[PDB]
């Protein structure tokens, strides 16, 4: 998955669980190789936040809840088929590998992490993955400063289409985003990364920026604004029944990835990069 989805998923959990009270233990399917979640509370609230391609759930016991339980955070990585779904207790999805059940007050429901392929993972604790940089959606300024400050890193000797997938610097950018981003600026996917960013190495006022930056956004600005477009398009459809409608809108939003006429190549990782025109000097 890519940044927009994790963000939208987090929004869904928070909104759906805002007034729900969960209780009991957190159940993991026997088949799941992920860790068991030591937790038990008669009444707790679930909240979530996202950062790049990671979603963090926080389980917070309500006052009076028993037995004594400290808040617990869990960080998830969705994988190809992972998702969060809120369903009726008697309709648990066949591939629900981690489940949280609502407490007696009101209709019995279950928040589930569903993942048929089981590529998804979760770890105990609220610590984000070591080395992942700032989220391109929620931490734009920190994301940008970190890239410019570390341009000397060997990560930028690779072609731009490959560096865009390096989560140490572009946390949240995935295969369809790098294609759409590069297409907006018509930047050859195999141009040396540092070469495309070098020029970017309380200065300009708003009037100056409006005159020379507004209609000429740079690669780093788009790493934030492009995925933000997907977030706006997605609205509050995650977790609902508007899946068909949402994918149709996403399909229409794409300008390059998997589009007719567009060229395609395989990077050193085997991932397909879509582009239009010149592939670049470092093309395989």
Swiss-Prot record:
**What does changing residue 155 to T do?**
Found in a patient with childhood-onset steroid-resistant nephrotic syndrome; uncertain significance
Where along this sequence does the record place binding of DNA?
175
Main localization is: cytoplasm
Q: Which residues form the active site?
A: 1-2, 53
**Induction line:** Up-regulated during S-phase.
- Is rRNA-binding set as a keyword in this record? no
Q: Which reaction does it catalyse?
A: 2'-deoxyribonucleotide-(2'-deoxyribose 5'-phosphate)-2'-deoxyribonucleotide-DNA = a 3'-end 2'-deoxyribonucleotide-(2,3-dehydro-2,3-deoxyribose 5'-phosphate)-DNA + a 5'-end 5'-phospho-2'-deoxyribonucleoside-DNA + H(+)
Molecular functions per Gene Ontology: class I DNA-(apurinic or apyrimidinic site) endonuclease activity; damaged DNA binding; DNA N-glycosylase activity; DNA-(apurinic or apyrimidinic site) endonuclease activity; hydrolase activity, acting on glycosyl bonds; zinc ion binding
Tissues with expression: Ubiquitous.
Q: Some GO term, biological process aspect, for this entry: which one?
A: response to oxidative stress
Mutating residue 53 to L: effect?
Loss of glycosylase activity
This protein's GO cellular component annotations are: centrosome; chromosome; cytoplasm; cytosol; nucleoplasm; nucleus
What are the UniProt keywords, alphabetically?
Chromosome, Cytoplasm, Cytoskeleton, DNA damage, DNA repair, DNA-binding, Glycosidase, Hydrolase, Lyase, Multifunctional enzyme, Nucleus
What domain of life does the UniProt record list for this protein's source?
Answer: Eukaryota
Enzyme Commission no: 3.2.2.-, 4.2.99.18
* Location(s) in or outside the cell: Cytoplasm, Cytoskeleton, Microtubule organizing center, Centrosome; Nucleus; Chromosome
Q: What the protein does?
A: Involved in base excision repair of DNA damaged by oxidation or by mutagenic agents. Acts as a DNA glycosylase that recognizes and removes damaged bases. Has a preference for oxidized pyrimidines, such as thymine glycol, formamidopyrimidine (Fapy) and 5-hydroxyuracil. Has marginal activity towards 8-oxoguanine. Has AP (apurinic/apyrimidinic) lyase activity and introduces nicks in the DNA strand. Cleaves the DNA backbone by beta-delta elimination to generate a single-strand break at the site of the removed base with both 3'- and 5'-phosphates.
The family assignment reads: Belongs to the FPG family.
Q: What is this protein called?
A: Endonuclease 8-like 1
Give the originating organism.
Homo sapiens (Human)
């Amino acid at each position: 998955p890519e940044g927009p989805e994790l963000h939208l998923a987090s929004q869904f959990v928070n909104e759906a669980c805002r007034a729900l009270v969960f209780g009991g233990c957190v159940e993991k399917s026997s088949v799941s190789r992920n860790p068991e979640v030591p937790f038990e509370s008669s009444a707790y609230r679930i909240s979530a936040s996202a950062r790049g391609k990671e979603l963090r759930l926080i389980l917070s016991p309500l006052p009076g809840a028993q037995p004594q339980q400290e808040p617990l955070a869990l960080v998830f990585r969705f994988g190809m088929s992972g998702s969060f779904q809120l369903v009726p207790r008697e309709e648990l999805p066949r591939h629900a590998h981690l489940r949280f059940y609502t407490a007696p007050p009101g209709p019995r429901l279950a928040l589930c992490f569903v993942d048929i392929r089981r590529f998804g993972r979760w770890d105990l604790g609220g610590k984000w993955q070591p080395g992942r940089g700032p989220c391109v959606l929620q931490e734009y300024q920190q994301f940008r400063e970190s890239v410019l400050r570390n341009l000397a890193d060997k990560a930028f000797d690779r072609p731009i289409c490959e560096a865009l997938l390096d989560q140490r610097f572009f946390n949240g950018i995935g295969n369809y985003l790098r294609a759409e981003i590069l297409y907006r600026l018509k930047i050859p996917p195999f141009e040396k990364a540092r070469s495309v960013l070098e020029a970017l190495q309380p200065e300009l006022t708003l009037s100056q920026k409006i005159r020379t930056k507004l209609q000429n956004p740079d690669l780093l600005e788009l790493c934030h604004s492009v995925p933000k477009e997907v977030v706006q398009l997605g609205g509050r459809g995650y977790g609902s029944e508007s899946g068909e409608e949402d994918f149709a809108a996403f399909r229409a939003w794409l300008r390059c990835y998997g589009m007719p006429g567009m060229s395609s190549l395989q990077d050193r990782h085997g991932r397909t990069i879509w582009f239009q025109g010149d592939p670049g000097p470092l093309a395989p």
